[PDB]
Every structure is written in structure tokens, then in C-alpha cells.
């Protein structure tokens with residue numbers, strides 16, 4: 608019965624991305640080979656089965672640094688981190704395989720499914 | 730040029746509300762007279778000019794407890810906190826004035842404007 612605000616969730620996500628761009632209340636750095644990316648653990652948990660499983664565990668919840676598998680492509684990771692904070696996925700012929708493999712590792716099914724649709728559409 | 734995921738922002742907000750319901754990575758309690766409400770500072774900053782102004786200030790960013798004005802109605806506050814995390818506003822004849830005054834204090838213009846529309850619609 609409540610009044611629905613159709614733009615509200617997008618407004619929240621935009622403001623969370625603005626906080627990330629200023630490093631405000633970021634609480635983790637994700638290390639991907641020679642690169643590092645700061646983020647909010649809450650957003651990572653909201654968007655990734657891997658990060659959900661890491662930070663729900665009381666053993667790991669307070670970690671300030673997460674080292675990803677050294678095989679993960681930093682560009683693929685950055686594309687997916689930007690997707691988490693924007694709802695926009697930068698998929699191209701030159702990055703689809705790295706993005707798809709990274710989304711499998713991060714446990715991000717809708718992106719993996721979208722990568723399969725991209726391949727089927729050539 | 731990116732692929733747009735129209736449901737993604739709502740999915741993120743739902744998962745942030747699920748984390749709030751489990752008290753996972755909440756980092757502040759908001760005290761409203763005899764009641765207390767836990768939340769994520771990032772979501773509060775994303776949805777309120779008052780909380781943005783409090784937590785952007787390096788003087789106050791690390792506060793774990795915020796005491797609101799003792800005049801603020803706890804039910805009005807709870808309605809607006811739920812709106813922040815759901816995009817749904819529970820506006821009724823019995824709560825409109827308290828919700829509107831609380832939204833003015835929290836600096837939440839779209840809700841204040843919606844309260845004005847509710848009054849104009851009787």
C-alpha cells in the first residue's frame with residue numbers, strides 16, 4: 608500500500624558511487640595482482656556471492672585487505688566493480704572472456720548469463 | 730554504450746536492507762528519544778542531507794552514536810529509515826504531519842514534496 612519511489616534505488620546507488628569516488632567510508636581494498644581497488648564491503652556483499660561468503664563469515668568480516676586469485680584480470684575486475692556501483696556493464700569483444708571468467712569467480716550470475724547472451728549474439 | 734541492468738539498483742538496495750535486518754556491517758545507532766535504530770552510515774548519507782552533513786565532516790565521521798533532536802517522533806523516523814532502504818513510503822492521515830516534519834529535519838526533499846502532494850490530495 609506504500610507510495611513507491613521508482614528512481615530512489617538508482618539515486619542511492621549513484622550516491623554510494625560518489626562516496627566511493629571520494630573514498631568516504633570505504634572499508635576494504637581489493638588487491639588484484641599489481642592493482643588495488645577500494646570499496647564498501649556492504650556493496651560488494653550485495654553484488655557478489657564471493658564477497659558475501661567472505662564478509663558474512665565472522666572469521667573474515669573485519670579484514671581490511673582481500674587478495675584475489677593472482678589469475679584474475681584487473682581490467683575485468685574493475686569493469687565488474689563499476690557495474691556493481693552503476694548498473695552499467697562495459698562488455699566488448701576484447702573484454703568479454705575476461706569479464707565472464709571474473710564474474711564466475713565473483714559469483715555474479717546475471718553478468719555471467721549476459722556474457723553468454725553476448726557470445727550467442729556474436 | 731554500456732548494457733543497462735534496470736533491476737540492479739533495487740537488487741542492491743534489497744540486499745543492503747537484508748544486511749541491516751541481520752545487523753551486518755551496521756556502523757551507527759541513531760537514538761530517537763527512548764528508541765534506537767541501527768543503520769549503515771553510507772545509506773544514511775545517500776538519503777539524507779542531515780546525515781550527509783554529519784558524516785562528511787571529519788570531526789563526526791567516526792561517531793558510533795547520533796542523538797537526534799528529542800522532539801523527533803520515533804515512528805516518523807522509523808518510517809523514513811524504512812523508506813531509505815526500500816523506496817516505499819508508508820504515508821497515512823495519522824502519520825503525515827510527523828513524517829513531513831521528520832523529513833524536513835533529515836533534509837529529504839522528495840519525501841517533503843510528496844507529503845505536500847498528499848496534503849493537496851486530502
Ligand SMILES: Cn1cc(C#CCn2cnc3c(c(-c4cccc(C#N)c4)cn3CC(=O)Nc3ccncc3Cl)c2=O)cn1
Pocket residue numbers: 652653654655656657659710711712713714715716717718719737740741744745747748
Ligand atoms: C561459478 N558461478 C557462480 C555464479 C553465481 C551466482 C549467484 N549469486 C550469488 N550470490 C550473489 C549474487 C549477487 C548479485 C547481485 C547483483 C548483481 C549480480 C550480478 N551479476 C549478482 C549477490 N550475491 C550475494 C548475495 O546474495 N548477498 C546477500 C544475500 C542475502 N542477504 C544479504 C546479502 Cl548482501 C549472485 O549472482 C556465477 N558463476
Ligand SMILES: Cn1cc(C#CCn2cnc3c(c(-c4cccc(C#N)c4)cn3CC(=O)Nc3ccncc3Cl)c2=O)cn1
Pocket residue numbers: 615618619622623625626774775776777778779781832833834835836837838839840841
Ligand atoms: C528543510 N528541508 C531541507 C530539505 C532538503 C533537502 C535536500 N537533500 C539534501 N541532501 C540529500 C537529499 C538526499 C535524498 C536522497 C534520496 C531520497 C531523498 C528523499 N526524500 C533525499 C540525499 N542527500 C544527501 C546527498 O546528496 N548525499 C550525497 C551527495 C553527494 N555525494 C555523495 C552523497 Cl552520499 C536531499 O533531499 C527538505 N526540507
Ligand SMILES: [Cl-]
Pocket residue numbers: 624689692693
Ligand atoms: Cl563508476
Ligand SMILES: [Cl-]
Pocket residue numbers: 699700701702
Ligand atoms: Cl573490443
Ligand SMILES: [Cl-]
Pocket residue numbers: 746811814815
Ligand atoms: Cl524494511
Ligand SMILES: [Cl-]
Pocket residue numbers: 821822823824
Ligand atoms: Cl491513518
